[PDB]
Amino acid sequence: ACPSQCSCSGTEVNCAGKSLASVPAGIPTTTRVLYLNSNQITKLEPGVFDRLANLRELHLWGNQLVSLPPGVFDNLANLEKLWLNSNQLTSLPAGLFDRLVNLEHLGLCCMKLTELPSGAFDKLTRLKQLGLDQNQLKSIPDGAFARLPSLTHVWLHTNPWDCQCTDILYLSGWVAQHSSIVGEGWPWRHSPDSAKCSGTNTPVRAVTEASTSPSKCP
Amino acid sequence: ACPSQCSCSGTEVNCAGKSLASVPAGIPTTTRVLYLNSNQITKLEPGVFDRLANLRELHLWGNQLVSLPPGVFDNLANLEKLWLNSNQLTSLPAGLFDRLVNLEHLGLCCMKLTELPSGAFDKLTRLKQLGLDQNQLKSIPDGAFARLPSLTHVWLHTNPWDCQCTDILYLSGWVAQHSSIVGEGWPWRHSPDSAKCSGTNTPVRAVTEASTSPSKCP
Amino acid sequence: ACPSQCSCSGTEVNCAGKSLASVPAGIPTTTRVLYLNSNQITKLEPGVFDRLANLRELHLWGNQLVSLPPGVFDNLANLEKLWLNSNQLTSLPAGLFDRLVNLEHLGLCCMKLTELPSGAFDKLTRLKQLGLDQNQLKSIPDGAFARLPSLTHVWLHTNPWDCQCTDILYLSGWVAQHSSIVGEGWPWRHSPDSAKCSGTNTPVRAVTEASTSPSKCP
Amino acid sequence: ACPSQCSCSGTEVNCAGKSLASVPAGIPTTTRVLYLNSNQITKLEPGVFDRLANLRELHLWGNQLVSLPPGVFDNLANLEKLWLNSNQLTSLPAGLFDRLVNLEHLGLCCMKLTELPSGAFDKLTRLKQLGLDQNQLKSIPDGAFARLPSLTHVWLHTNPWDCQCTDILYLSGWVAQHSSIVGEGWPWRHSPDSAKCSGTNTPVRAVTEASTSPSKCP
Numbered sequence: 001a002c003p004s005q006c007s008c009s010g011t012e013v014n015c016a017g018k019s020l021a022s023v024p025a026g027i028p029t030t031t032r033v034l035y036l037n038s039n040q041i042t043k044l045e046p047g048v049f050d051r052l053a054n055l056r057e058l059h060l061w062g063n064q065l066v067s068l069p070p071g072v073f074d075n076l077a078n079l080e081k082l083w084l085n086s087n088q089l090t091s092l093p094a095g096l097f098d099r100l101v102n103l104e105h106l107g108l109c110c111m112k113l114t115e116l117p118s119g120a121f122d123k124l125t126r127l128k129q130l131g132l133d134q135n136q137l138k139s140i141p142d143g144a145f146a147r148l149p150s151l152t153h154v155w156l157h158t159n160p161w162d163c164q165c166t167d168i169l170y171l172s173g174w175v176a177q178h179s180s181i182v183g184e185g186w187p188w189r190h191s192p193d194s195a196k197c198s199g200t201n202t203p204v205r206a207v208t209e210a211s212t213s214p215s216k217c218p
Numbered sequence: 219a220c221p222s223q224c225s226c227s228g229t230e231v232n233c234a235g236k237s238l239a240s241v242p243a244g245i246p247t248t249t250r251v252l253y254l255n256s257n258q259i260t261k262l263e264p265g266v267f268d269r270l271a272n273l274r275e276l277h278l279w280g281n282q283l284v285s286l287p288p289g290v291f292d293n294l295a296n297l298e299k300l301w302l303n304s305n306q307l308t309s310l311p312a313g314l315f316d317r318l319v320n321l322e323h324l325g326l327c328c329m330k331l332t333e334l335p336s337g338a339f340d341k342l343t344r345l346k347q348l349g350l351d352q353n354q355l356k357s358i359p360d361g362a363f364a365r366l367p368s369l370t371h372v373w374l375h376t377n378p379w380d381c382q383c384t385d386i387l388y389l390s391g392w393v394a395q396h397s398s399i400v401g402e403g404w405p406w407r408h409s410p411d412s413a414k415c416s417g418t419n420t421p422v423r424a425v426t427e428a429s430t431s432p433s434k435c436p
Numbered sequence: 437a438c439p440s441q442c443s444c445s446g447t448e449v450n451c452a453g454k455s456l457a458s459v460p461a462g463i464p465t466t467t468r469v470l471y472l473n474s475n476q477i478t479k480l481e482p483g484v485f486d487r488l489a490n491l492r493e494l495h496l497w498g499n500q501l502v503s504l505p506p507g508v509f510d511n512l513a514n515l516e517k518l519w520l521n522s523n524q525l526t527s528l529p530a531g532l533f534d535r536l537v538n539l540e541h542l543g544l545c546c547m548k549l550t551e552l553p554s555g556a557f558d559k560l561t562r563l564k565q566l567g568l569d570q571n572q573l574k575s576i577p578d579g580a581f582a583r584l585p586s587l588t589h590v591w592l593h594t595n596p597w598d599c600q601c602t603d604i605l606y607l608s609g610w611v612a613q614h615s616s617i618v619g620e621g622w623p624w625r626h627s628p629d630s631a632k633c634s635g636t637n638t639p640v641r642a643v644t645e646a647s648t649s650p651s652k653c654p
Numbered sequence: 655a656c657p658s659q660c661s662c663s664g665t666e667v668n669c670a671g672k673s674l675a676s677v678p679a680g681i682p683t684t685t686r687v688l689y690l691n692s693n694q695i696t697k698l699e700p701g702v703f704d705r706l707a708n709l710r711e712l713h714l715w716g717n718q719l720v721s722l723p724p725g726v727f728d729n730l731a732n733l734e735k736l737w738l739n740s741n742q743l744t745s746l747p748a749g750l751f752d753r754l755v756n757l758e759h760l761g762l763c764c765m766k767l768t769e770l771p772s773g774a775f776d777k778l779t780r781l782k783q784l785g786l787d788q789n790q791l792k793s794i795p796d797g798a799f800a801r802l803p804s805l806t807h808v809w810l811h812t813n814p815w816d817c818q819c820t821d822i823l824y825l826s827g828w829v830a831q832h833s834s835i836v837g838e839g840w841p842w843r844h845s846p847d848s849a850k851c852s853g854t855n856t857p858v859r860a861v862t863e864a865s866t867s868p869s870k871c872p
């Protein structure tokens with residue numbers, strides 16, 4: 001069992017760099033590590049992974065995804081690493097990650113996200129590493145990181161953070177307090193000022209309530 | 219806290235690419251993932267990892283190691299991934315890996331290994347992935363892979379296999395039998411003929427007893 | 437979501453000691469630890485566990501199972517502990533355990549096993565503990581423990597080992613050499629002579645070929 | 655190697671029921687599961703476990719410990735189950751459990767604890783099961799369970815909860831809210847009214863602020 005375009009042995013399936021335009025059929029049920037990265041996949045069918053309950057790592061980075069079906073990861077209860085970096089997402093459905101209670105690494109950089117849904121990470125009690133850098137994020141919803149007790153590495157740089165708007169105060173206070181975990185590069189390197197306000201290029205960590213106004217919020 | 223040159227958060231310590239000449243002091247005891255790769259480390263003190271029992275991943279690839287103290291990994295009972303690729307090793311001490319009973323990935327490519335000690339891998343019951351490519355190996359000892367029952371991926375290419383000598387018959391037989399797991403690249407791709415006789419450019423797995431002679435052994 | 441008769445919280449489902457005659461419906465898909473022991477279950481529906489792929493521990497001990505459907509554990513790739521002790525089995529279907537590649541504890545004591553299928557344990561590479569005591573075993577198939585390299589604990593006592601028959605020599609030779617792992621009790625206690633010949637009270641590990649004859653075998 | 659009083663194979667050491675008055679010498683450094691239960695151990699040397707970094711399960715239950723040195727569990731970073739049930743502890747040093755970031759079951763029942771230290775469980779992010787039943791507890795410190803996001807099973811019965819005192823209100827409000835995880839027996843069975851006020855036999859989760867007064871707090 002192995003899609004003809006891929007290499008498969010043991011519990012690892014390598015479909016990387018194969019000019020794939022869709023997720024191939026015949027990925028074994030027993031697969032733990034799935035490389036689908038660096039292809040030209042433009043969409044996921046709902047249910048494409050329903051059958052792949054055993055996955056520990058899902059590598060989807062460097063594809064062309066423009067949206068993700070709601071529920072698409074819902075059977076992945078064992079998933080430990082989810083790499084979605086360098087796709088073309090502009091948003092994420094609510095509840096996307098709620099079933100990924102064992103997730104330890106989540107990569108969401110280098111796309112075009114304009115916001116995150118309000119409860120996006122609330123179930124990710126084991127999450128350690130979270131990559132949000134290089135998107136179009138202006139704010140982080142209030143409380144968004146409050147249920148991430150295992151978090152030790154985060155990436156926030158290269159987002160047009162809107163520091164004139166009162167919405168930024170959650171993040172700006174959070175970064176000030178969790179400043180040892182804010183970084184850049186791969187693997188992570190400590191970089192606490194790397195989250196910067198749009199237009200002023202000043203640190204998000206240094207924004208005050210005085211310098212913001214409800215009137216600056218869209 | 220953290221070695222001065224490195225970034226540390228959670229249980230991950232990143233000292234990669236820091237022009238290091240030795241293994242820095244102050245790596246916390248709780249470290250699980252240690253990146254020491256891409257430096258200019260020339261040697262390891264005996265005992266350097268004795269206080270790092272919690273390591274799961276040890277990235278030592280791309281350094282200048284020429285030998286390894288015997289027993290240097292002996293405390294690493296939880297070690298799951300050991301990357302020694304691209305160092306300058308010409309041999310491995312006997313018993314080097316014997317304590318590593320939970321090892322799942324072992325990278326030994328791209329150095330100058332001229333042989334393997336006879337029992338090298340006997341204890342690695344859980345080893346899934348083994349990289350031996352790009353060395354100076356002419357032969358594998360008889361029975362060398364017999365006690366690697368969990369092995370699903372192996373790299374053997376780019377070694378001067380000496381197929382005129384009768385010693386090559388263990389390996390040639392083994393490769394023919396375990397064809398499905400022999401490969402190339404990162405991540406692994408199926409490539410069972412990548413192991414070639416030096417010169418004749420015949421695949422190792424196609425060698426017959428008839429073409430070999432004990433008189434051609436060094 | 438929880439069977440009415442059971443208690444459920446997190447990923448543990450306790451249906452133990454509930455006077456059940458069958459496996460109840462409504463066991464969540466996310467269940468990792470499933471207690472069905474100490475009931476009056478007499479049989480399993482084929483497919484009963486097809487949906488429970490996240491199981492790590494399956495406690496079926498102290499029921500009244502007389503047979504097991506083939507393929508019944510086939511979807512349990514993450515299974516780590518399987519406890520079938522004190523049921524009423526007289527045999528096991530071929531390949532019953534083949535998909536259980538992560539299995540670390542397998543209990544099969546205290547039933548009515550007359551034999552084991554030839555390759556029963558061949559895939560259980562990570563098996564550490566195996567309980568075969570208190571059955572009706574006369575011999576172990578030649579080679580039956582050869583593909584159990586992770587094995588550190590085994591129980592063999594209280595079986596009518598037929599020491600007149602030459603088939604016992606696999607076992608007797610194996611025990612003599614793996615003597616440190618043979619034992620008794622819960623948790624295990626070292627007990628190398630506990631496995632004894634039927635009628636003679638002679639330890640199985642001391643049997644000689646001189647006392648046995650192919651003429652006394654099946 | 656094994657202590658002479660005990661039985662050992664693989665990574666399990668069985669010193670249970672051996673009339674031990676102290677922790678014996680010669681427990682291997684590679685030990686993962688250590689049974690020191692049902693002995694007559696009355697204290698632990700500071701540093702006794704410093705060398706046992708690989709422990710996953712520590713069974714210390716049914717001895718006669720009266721105190722525990724602070725720092726004693728500090729090197730047990732991999733510890734997943736800690737069983738201290740049925741000793742004679744009346745208090746726990748502050749920070750006792752702070753290094754046990756991977757602990758999933760903690761048994762503290764059936765002793766003489768008269769209080770818990772304020773931040774006792776603050777670091778136990780993965781704690782799933784916590785046994786506090788059968789002690790001398792009158793209240794639980796404010797916020798004590800707030801940093802146990804993984805907690806799915808708790809035992810609180812058979813404690814003389816002082817419901818007349820305002821200090822009970824954290825606990826009563828907590829039990830009402832987390833009612834589905836409150837239980838009894840082994841394995842856990844659901845039993846939310848099992849925690850009862852002394853004298854009144856009123857479930858703790860049913861206490862009102864009106865029935866309590868800061869004047870009844872000694």
Ligand SMILES: CC(=O)N[C@@H]1[C@@H](O[C@@H]2O[C@H](CO)[C@H](O)[C@H](O)[C@H]2O)[C@@H](O)[C@@H](CO)O[C@@H]1O
Nearest residue numbers: 061083085086106107108109131155185186
């Ligand atoms: C997408 C890419 O450029 N490379 C991948 C790595 O990317 C990094 O991810 C972290 C965490 O999400 C962070 O956002 C970095 O800025 C980003 O480069 C990483 O996802 C790995 C996973 O193994 O794959 C690519 O190398």
Ligand SMILES: CC(=O)N[C@@H]1[C@@H](O[C@@H]2O[C@H](CO)[C@H](O)[C@H](O)[C@H]2O)[C@@H](O)[C@@H](CO)O[C@@H]1O
Nearest residue numbers: 301303304324325326327349351373403404
């Ligand atoms: C630059 C280098 O050596 N690459 C490392 C990766 O490499 C490969 O390792 C596999 C497994 O042994 C095989 O030998 C390949 O030929 C080799 O390129 C891989 O080990 C990663 C994991 O950290 O490290 C480097 O990237």
Ligand SMILES: CC(=O)N[C@@H]1[C@@H](O[C@@H]2O[C@H](CO)[C@H](O)[C@H](O)[C@H]2O)[C@@H](O)[C@@H](CO)O[C@@H]1O
Nearest residue numbers: 497519521522542543544545567569591622
């Ligand atoms: C009576 C019974 O089946 N007890 C179960 C325990 O039994 C021990 O199991 C081991 C290994 O199979 C060995 O066979 C012993 O003889 C037997 O007593 C044990 O399996 C536990 C596991 O949680 O369940 C019952 O207690």
